[PDB]
Amino acid sequence: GLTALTMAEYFRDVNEQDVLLFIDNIFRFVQAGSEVSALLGRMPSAVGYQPTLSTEMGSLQERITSTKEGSITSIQAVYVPADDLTDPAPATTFAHLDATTVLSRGLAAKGIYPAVDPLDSTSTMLQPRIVGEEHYEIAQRVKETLQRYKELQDIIAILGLDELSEEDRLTVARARKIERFLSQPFFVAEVFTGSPGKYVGLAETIRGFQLILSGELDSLPEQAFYLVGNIDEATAKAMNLEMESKL
Amino acid sequence: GLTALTMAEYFRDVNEQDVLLFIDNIFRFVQAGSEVSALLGRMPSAVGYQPTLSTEMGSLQERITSTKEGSITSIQAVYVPADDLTDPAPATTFAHLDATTVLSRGLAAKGIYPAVDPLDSTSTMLQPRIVGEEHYEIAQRVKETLQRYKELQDIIAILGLDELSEEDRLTVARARKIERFLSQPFFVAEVFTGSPGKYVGLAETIRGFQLILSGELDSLPEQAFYLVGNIDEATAKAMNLEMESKL
Amino acid sequence: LNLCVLTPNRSIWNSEVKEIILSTNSGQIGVLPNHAPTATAVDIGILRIRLNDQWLTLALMGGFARIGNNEITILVNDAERGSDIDPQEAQQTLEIAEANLRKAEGKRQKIEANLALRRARTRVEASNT
Amino acid sequence: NLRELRDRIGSVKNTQKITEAMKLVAAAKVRRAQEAVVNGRPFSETLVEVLYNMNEQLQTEDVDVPLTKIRTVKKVALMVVTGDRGLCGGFNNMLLKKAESRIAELKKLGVDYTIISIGKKGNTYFIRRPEIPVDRYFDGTNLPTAKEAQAIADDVFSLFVSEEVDKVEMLYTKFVSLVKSDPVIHTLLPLSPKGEICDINGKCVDAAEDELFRLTTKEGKLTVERDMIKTETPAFSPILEFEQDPAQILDALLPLYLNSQILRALQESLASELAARMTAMSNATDNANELKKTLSINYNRARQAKITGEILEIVAGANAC
Amino acid sequence: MEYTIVVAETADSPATLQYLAPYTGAALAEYFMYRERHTLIIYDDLSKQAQAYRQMSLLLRRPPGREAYPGDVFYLHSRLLERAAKLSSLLGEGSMTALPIVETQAGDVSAYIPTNVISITDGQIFLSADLFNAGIRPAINVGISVSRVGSAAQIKAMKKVAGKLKLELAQFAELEAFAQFASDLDKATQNQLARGQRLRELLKQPQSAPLTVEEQV
Amino acid sequence: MEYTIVVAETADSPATLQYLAPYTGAALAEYFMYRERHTLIIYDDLSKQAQAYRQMSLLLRRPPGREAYPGD
Amino acid sequence: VSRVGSAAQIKAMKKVAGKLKLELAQFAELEAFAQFASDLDKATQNQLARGQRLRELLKQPQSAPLTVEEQV
């Protein structure tokens, strides 16, 4: 990792370019010297942890800095250890990363690929100051519905979708939908997926989520929202599945 | 606590007095001795305790004693460590303890000074052998009044007390009065309030709990029974309020 | 007189009044201060209250009334406030009812539609009133 | 992992709060329903007074009312007042299984089982028992009004006004307890010549002194007493005169009385659904706090387990540093 | 106390004194026991003793096991508990009726102390803490309780007096399993339910009231 | 920042500096507060310092306590 | 939860704030009623509305601080 950092300084310090730094496996990068501390006889820290691994990842992240010379944009990636968030790796990593993404093994359990941890991936640049109160307001409504959806989903699995009120069930529709329309295809994914990937531009899905929380394609299905590119393409998939339901 | 016990062990023998022993917090003391095991390099026990934290806890606990000259009577404070009844720390404390007692948030909310937990104390010395079936029977009926009252408090909140039993209307008004007469002028309250602090006799409580538990004093308002530990004081202020409405 | 109008779900016009009048089987009678002890059924047709200032319709779709000693016990089967019904709305429902009366054949359905039209002309009537 | 255990513990807590909420909520629903069924006691009361009045004055061997015309045993219809929201206890399924027993009863008498239906769950149970004559399915009538009563009343009156349905019967769990309600079929059609309505079991419920659900707490559990106060059994006056007819007024009051019993029956089924839902949610809250204690027990057990793993990590250091 | 011997270790003992006074009681038991008498031991409690031996080998830094007990505590318990027998008539038929208190830490049956404690004990007598909260000391949760010899020493008096009671308690639990449904308990349901509710009243005693085996049967 | 001074530990801080810089800010508060002034401090998460002192005592080869934080 | 309390509050604040506490805990228990609050009583749905507006009276973004008086 330090060797990567040295090349990073050669391109972002020395060649001073807006650097692109894919970096993984950072949890294995922990795990090695984590394993080696007892091999060093450095004392047992936490569940696999080396002791000053805090400072080690601190030098990692602090070395991963956009200098005034170049912008060291840095794709870092650690295995969230067995989806334990308090596990000392991601625990240490939480202050380290600027924009961070847990994925959701619930959304991977929902089958999404991208399975974004919908409540649980945040950014420094997530702000109405930064993203715009268009974007921040939209996500405010969006995550609001998503969170109360996860909330009321407990009373769902206890109490049935019959127990739902009006706006709750509309939100539930919005939940399964905006889940599905939040899932996009990668052209990378096309062997494990088999779908054509759409490099989905941002304001397209800003429009789509504005429409989804607007309940425009509430007519459409979440099947018709499942792993698609545009809200227009979503309405198109609705047209396709509707004519298939004719067949 | 050892310094406390020796300074008290003077007056438990030298004064031979009824040694009151307020000690807060005992769980903090446990954590301190746990830290002493840590700084000892002692292999200390389960969830954070010293190994002989049981032994030291006994050693502290044992000296609280009714000796033949003076009686070291202790009230101490267990911080509920993560509210774990499975905490061996809370286990050790409760083993040393004699009377588990909560103090009521909800009756300071109901305004009662002293805000003693009407349901959430416990008295190990409350055998009718030990406590006296006068006290034990009387307080068992008192607990039943409290139990039914708070237990169908929500039922009457749905229903009206009219829809409740007249028994319950006797019970709910009776126990509202029981909580009201349970609100007692504390001696230390005389500073902050100005009411003279009634050091309530045990038999006064016995007769008062009798009277309200009888419903012999059912003409007394809980308004009149409030802030009045003493039984004759409650009937007397019922007369005082009857005259003040009469004057 | 003490009108105790009473639907089979609500005591409708429990106001005592100056005057009421009723669709008799003679066609209409009127109540009368200290009227007879008498009783009367009313068809699907608007009862009326000419109470102290106002003469207006009580749209009942059936019922009876124990006219005691200036003591009306007027229990209807279904007594709307004919003031409350929108004239266009109940006239439209009356139109649909006359049309479905032209539609429904068969003795149960024909009588259901004709009595529906009866209560519907009653509905439109105090709705016209 | 420990946090998932703590998580589902909190989930159980959320559902437990919700469970107590559902029990008390449908208790409030049933409380307004108790208010509701009592809110018509004057109507049926003075009705039954006039009923025994003109039944005394009726006194005839020749006059008739069309509902009072018991017709030929060709087709009995089955009236099913029901509940609406699912899992409201199983008053839905108990009354529907008793309704299936009634389908068997009218298949045993050969009386061509027409089925009047109320309630959207009753509508769905009729819609899922497709081998019957569904007569006129009435919707889930949330706090049913005299309007829907008038409508399905008119359905009853039209069809049983024909011999087409002769001698129909009305299934409803009368709200006896907040816990017990097996279904009871009161004899709906042909209308009662005594006025005292019968069961389809055959039991002539009294014209004068009859049961009606009210609710009262004998001890801390609020309870349900199907109390019976008898109405005024005076006739109309000797000074009172029949201004139109004896016979036609009998024929008219039959629609009124049929409507009164029908509205009361729909109120009975709705209150039964409210109560059984409430009881199920209450028992669920009990089971909930139980499972909560079991879960938190294993949670603190796992807390000890995490502490033990920490102790293990401590122990390797004892040989290490 | 004429017929007894009070084995007294204060709570603030040496943890070894706690960790060995079991053996002291074992010896004093063996005296009257190898004096062929009936004898009876009452340990209260090995759980605190388990804490003690945990603390003892812990002070040794001998690496303890599951739930921080060292392992041989059960073996210590096997040092303890394996003494008790109605011995051979060849030995002299001396009875040593040991029965220990066993502290229910939060009702956790998988406390390693309790986990071992069952494994030695031929009988397991689990108390009723809810009925202790019902004050109903003598409070015994009789279903979770167990004993291998249920009637081999219960008299023909006792067995033919209380086998019906045993099944009466079992069926009392059965008609006590889920009596919150039927809403008019029939004399089958209610008479067994109040017969067994009467049994729930019936086993209850004021404490220290050893009733006669006569009065028992 | 007129009213605020700033002190900071790096993520790449030597954890001695982390391990005491809290007390350093506390003494800064002392130089304000023994001067009778109202003064406020904002201690960014001492859990980081807890991992630090964990790294310290483990670096000290010292006795580790409850979840590897030192008892000290 | 906090320890100091009204010694740290303005009496200006405290007069409103006690009612804020009472209504806040009231809505807090009544947070269960929400999905079934169609069948809510007049004071029940009304206290729900009061605690609802009070709940609205909470939120503030990143750097949406207010003075004492505006909050008053």
Coordinates of C-alpha atoms in Angstrom, one line a residue, chain D residues 129-296:
Chain D
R129 CA -65.7 -20.1 -2.2
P130 CA -66.8 -19.9 -5.8
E131 CA -69.3 -22.8 -5.6
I132 CA -72.3 -21.0 -4.2
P133 CA -74.8 -18.4 -5.1
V134 CA -73.4 -15.1 -3.9
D135 CA -76.6 -13.1 -3.5
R136 CA -75.5 -9.4 -3.0
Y137 CA -72.1 -9.0 -1.5
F138 CA -72.0 -5.9 0.7
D139 CA -68.7 -4.2 1.3
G140 CA -66.6 -3.9 4.4
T141 CA -68.8 -1.3 6.0
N142 CA -66.5 0.5 8.4
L143 CA -68.8 1.7 11.2
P144 CA -71.7 0.7 9.1
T145 CA -74.4 3.4 8.4
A146 CA -78.1 3.1 8.0
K147 CA -77.5 3.8 4.4
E148 CA -75.7 0.5 3.6
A149 CA -78.2 -1.0 6.1
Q150 CA -81.0 0.4 3.9
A151 CA -79.4 -0.9 0.7
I152 CA -78.7 -4.5 1.8
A153 CA -81.9 -4.3 3.7
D154 CA -83.6 -3.5 0.4
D155 CA -81.7 -6.5 -1.1
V156 CA -83.2 -8.7 1.6
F157 CA -86.6 -7.1 1.2
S158 CA -86.7 -7.5 -2.5
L159 CA -85.4 -11.1 -2.7
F160 CA -87.3 -12.4 0.3
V161 CA -90.2 -10.4 -0.9
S162 CA -90.1 -12.9 -3.7
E163 CA -90.6 -16.6 -2.7
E164 CA -87.3 -16.9 -4.7
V165 CA -85.5 -16.7 -1.4
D166 CA -87.9 -18.2 1.1
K167 CA -86.9 -18.0 4.8
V168 CA -83.4 -16.6 4.7
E169 CA -81.1 -16.6 7.7
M170 CA -78.4 -14.2 9.0
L171 CA -75.0 -15.4 10.3
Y172 CA -73.2 -13.1 12.7
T173 CA -71.1 -13.6 15.8
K174 CA -73.1 -11.6 18.3
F175 CA -70.6 -9.8 20.5
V176 CA -70.9 -12.0 23.6
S177 CA -67.3 -11.7 24.9
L178 CA -64.2 -9.9 23.9
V179 CA -62.8 -13.4 23.7
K180 CA -65.6 -15.7 22.7
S181 CA -67.7 -15.3 19.7
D182 CA -68.7 -18.4 17.8
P183 CA -71.0 -17.5 14.9
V184 CA -74.8 -17.4 15.5
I185 CA -77.3 -17.4 12.7
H186 CA -80.4 -15.5 13.7
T187 CA -83.5 -16.4 11.6
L188 CA -83.5 -13.5 9.2
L189 CA -86.4 -14.2 6.9
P190 CA -89.5 -14.8 6.8
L191 CA -90.2 -12.1 9.4
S192 CA -91.4 -13.2 12.9
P193 CA -95.1 -13.4 13.4
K194 CA -94.6 -12.9 17.1
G195 CA -92.0 -10.3 16.2
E196 CA -89.7 -12.2 18.6
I197 CA -86.9 -13.1 16.1
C198 CA -85.5 -16.6 16.0
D199 CA -82.2 -18.2 15.4
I200 CA -81.5 -20.3 12.4
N201 CA -80.5 -22.7 15.1
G202 CA -84.1 -22.2 15.9
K203 CA -83.9 -20.3 19.2
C204 CA -86.6 -17.6 19.3
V205 CA -84.8 -14.6 20.7
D206 CA -87.2 -12.6 22.8
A207 CA -89.2 -9.7 21.3
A208 CA -88.9 -7.7 24.6
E209 CA -85.9 -8.6 26.7
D210 CA -82.8 -9.4 24.6
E211 CA -79.1 -9.3 24.8
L212 CA -76.9 -6.4 23.7
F213 CA -73.1 -6.1 24.0
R214 CA -71.7 -3.6 26.4
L215 CA -68.2 -3.6 28.0
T216 CA -67.1 -3.2 31.6
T217 CA -63.9 -4.1 33.5
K218 CA -64.2 -6.7 36.0
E219 CA -60.7 -6.8 37.2
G220 CA -57.7 -5.2 35.4
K221 CA -58.7 -6.8 32.1
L222 CA -61.5 -4.8 30.5
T223 CA -64.4 -7.1 29.8
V224 CA -67.6 -7.6 27.8
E225 CA -71.1 -8.2 29.3
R226 CA -73.9 -8.9 26.8
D227 CA -76.4 -7.2 29.0
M228 CA -80.2 -7.4 28.7
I229 CA -82.5 -4.5 29.7
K230 CA -86.1 -4.9 28.7
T231 CA -87.8 -2.1 26.8
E232 CA -91.2 -0.5 27.6
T233 CA -93.9 -3.0 27.0
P234 CA -96.9 -0.7 26.8
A235 CA -99.0 -0.9 23.7
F236 CA -100.1 2.2 21.8
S237 CA -103.0 4.0 23.3
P238 CA -106.6 2.9 23.5
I239 CA -107.3 6.5 22.4
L240 CA -104.8 5.8 19.6
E241 CA -106.3 5.0 16.2
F242 CA -104.8 3.2 13.2
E243 CA -105.1 6.1 10.7
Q244 CA -104.2 4.0 7.6
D245 CA -104.6 0.2 8.2
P246 CA -103.8 -2.4 10.8
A247 CA -102.7 -4.8 8.1
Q248 CA -100.6 -2.5 5.9
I249 CA -98.9 -1.0 9.0
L250 CA -97.9 -4.5 9.9
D251 CA -96.6 -4.9 6.4
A252 CA -94.7 -1.6 6.7
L253 CA -93.2 -2.2 10.1
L254 CA -91.8 -5.5 8.8
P255 CA -89.3 -3.5 6.6
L256 CA -88.6 -1.4 9.7
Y257 CA -88.1 -4.3 12.0
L258 CA -86.1 -6.2 9.4
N259 CA -83.9 -3.2 9.0
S260 CA -83.5 -2.8 12.8
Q261 CA -82.4 -6.4 13.2
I262 CA -80.1 -6.2 10.2
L263 CA -78.4 -3.0 11.3
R264 CA -78.0 -4.6 14.8
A265 CA -76.5 -7.8 13.2
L266 CA -74.0 -5.8 11.1
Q267 CA -73.1 -4.0 14.3
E268 CA -72.7 -7.3 16.0
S269 CA -70.3 -8.7 13.4
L270 CA -68.3 -5.5 13.2
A271 CA -67.9 -5.3 17.0
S272 CA -67.0 -8.9 17.1
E273 CA -64.3 -8.3 14.6
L274 CA -63.1 -5.2 16.6
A275 CA -62.9 -7.2 19.8
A276 CA -61.2 -10.3 18.4
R277 CA -58.6 -8.1 16.7
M278 CA -58.1 -6.4 20.0
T279 CA -57.7 -9.7 21.9
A280 CA -55.3 -11.1 19.3
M281 CA -53.1 -8.0 19.6
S282 CA -53.3 -8.1 23.4
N283 CA -52.2 -11.8 23.5
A284 CA -49.6 -10.9 20.9
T285 CA -48.2 -8.1 23.1
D286 CA -47.9 -10.7 25.9
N287 CA -46.1 -13.1 23.6
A288 CA -44.1 -10.2 22.4
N289 CA -42.7 -9.1 25.8
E290 CA -42.1 -12.8 26.5
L291 CA -40.0 -13.2 23.3
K292 CA -38.4 -9.9 24.2
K293 CA -37.2 -11.2 27.5
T294 CA -35.9 -14.4 25.8
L295 CA -34.1 -12.4 23.2
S296 CA -32.5 -10.0 25.7

